[PDB]
Amino acid sequence: STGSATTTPIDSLDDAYITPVQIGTPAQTLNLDFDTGSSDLWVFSSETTASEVDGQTIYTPSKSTTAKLLSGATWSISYGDGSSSSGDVYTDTVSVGGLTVTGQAVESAKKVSSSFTEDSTIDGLLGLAFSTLNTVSPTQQKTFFDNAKASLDSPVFTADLGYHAPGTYNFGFIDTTAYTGSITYTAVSTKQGFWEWTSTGYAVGSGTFKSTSIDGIADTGTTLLYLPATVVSAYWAQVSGAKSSSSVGGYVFPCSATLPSFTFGVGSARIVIPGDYIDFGPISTGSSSCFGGIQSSAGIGINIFGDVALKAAFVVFNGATTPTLGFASK
Missing domain, CATH: 2.40.70.10 (Acid Proteases)
Known part of the structure; x- marks a missing residue:
């Protein structure tokens, strides 16, 4: 079926x-x-x-x-x-x-x-x-x-x-018509009950790719992309006027900005999140401060590949005896 x-x-x-x-x-x-x-x-x-x-x-x-x-x-x-x-x-x-x-x-x-x-x-x-x-x-x-x-x-x-x-x-x-190129599969740990995997790194905009292991979960029920503070700081440093606001509860940026893309690694493959996907709009109605879609995971205790990341890909949740996750561009 x-x-x-x-x-x-x-x-x-x-x-x-x-x-x-x-x-x-x-x-x-x-x-x-x-x-x-x-x-x-x-x-x-x-x-x-x-x-x-x-x-x-x-x-x-x-x-x-x-x-x-x-x-x-x-x-x-x-x-x-x-x-x-x-x-x-x-x-x-x-x-x-x-x-x-x-x-x-x-x-x-x-x-x-x-x-x-x-x-x-x-x-x-x-x-x-x-x-x-x-x-x-x-x-x-x-x-x-x-x-x-x-x-x-x-x-x-x-x-x-x-x-x-x-x-x-x-x-x-x-559905082989729903994605482009090939699907790259990556290992899953079920030890915490999640679809937990390890990304192979990231890039900001047109910048060079940083090879670094980022353990996190594929979570369709979380809106944003939550990553280590180092990674998130490197991203927002490329947006003029962006800052972390304790009063708002995360990174905000001028609504006049054009956001850079964010790339994450899946094995040797790369998924590109367009900058527009990272815009969550005014912090309050009519504000010129906009809320960012990439936020720090510090104090969550886990990195979360939420909707911001997942919607940039076709994602396979493989529930075979040894589960794995697949990502393709689309």
């Missing part, structure tokens, strides 16, 4: 991407944030505290003939941006782009933090990291991908995120 679903930016900045997902019988379609940095599939629901719902579409298990309470199971998750959610668990039929999993754990939110409430466009998350990170207790649950894997034509999924445009998540096949 295979699946193919379009993923769409939630706003003009590509802050996140939503993908329609069918849950239950008859289908209830919710728009979920596919997150390769976490491993819970959770939804706004009929159980979510009413004051914490503001425009989201909810899953109502009582209206699904295939929903079953997973008795005694609870979940609770906290994300890197400080947001959180928690609740109880149902199993139900879940389909993505024509690919169906029966008995998928669907984590129903009883509580969500303010950032989730405030984002009316995101009806929940669909985790695509390794199932070892799943938070369901006392019986840990598998991700949608883990459950689908054995049925897939090939044990892979791909992320093809657009810049200010829709893109695609495919399951079970590699």
Whole structure:
């Protein structure tokens, strides 16, 4: 089997991407944030505290003939941006782009933090990291991908995120028309439960490539590119007037700037992030200070190849017995 679903930016900045997902019988379609940095599939629901719902579409298990309470199971998750959610668990039929999993754990939110409430466009998350990170207790649950894997034509999924445009998540096949040149594969460590890999270096603009190992995670659920302070300083030093602002919470730059590109290494291959991808616009409405899309990972504890990086590539998440990651230009 295979699946193919379009993923769409939630706003003009590509802050996140939503993908329609069918849950239950008859289908209830919710728009979920596919997150390769976490491993819970959770939804706004009929159980979510009413004051914490503001425009989201909810899953109502009582209206699904295939929903079953997973008795005694609870979940609770906290994300890197400080947001959180928690609740109880149902199993139900879940389909993505024509690919169906029966008995998928669907984590129903009883509580969500303010950032989730405030984002009316995101009806929940669909985790695509390794199932070892799943938070369901006392019986840990598998991700949608883990459950689908054995049925897939090939044990892979791909992320093809657009810049200010829709893109695609495919399951079970590699669309050879979706990228240019060849795919370069690189080793993954699953030790922390992430799609963790080591980039071979970077360049700023038309500058020379610096060969240096940068361990980080491929994380579709993180907006920006978070890299070591040394690398980030070298990037922003090439932008007149750019500075790190503790009041704003990172590097800002004059909105009048033209940003240089940023290149990262994948083995001997190179992925180029155009400068425009690094522009996250005015820090506040009408400001001439703009927020940067490359930020320091210092104090996160891990480097994160988030959407800014991933949307510059066609990315293969290879879930074979020994997982690997592939990157191609597009």
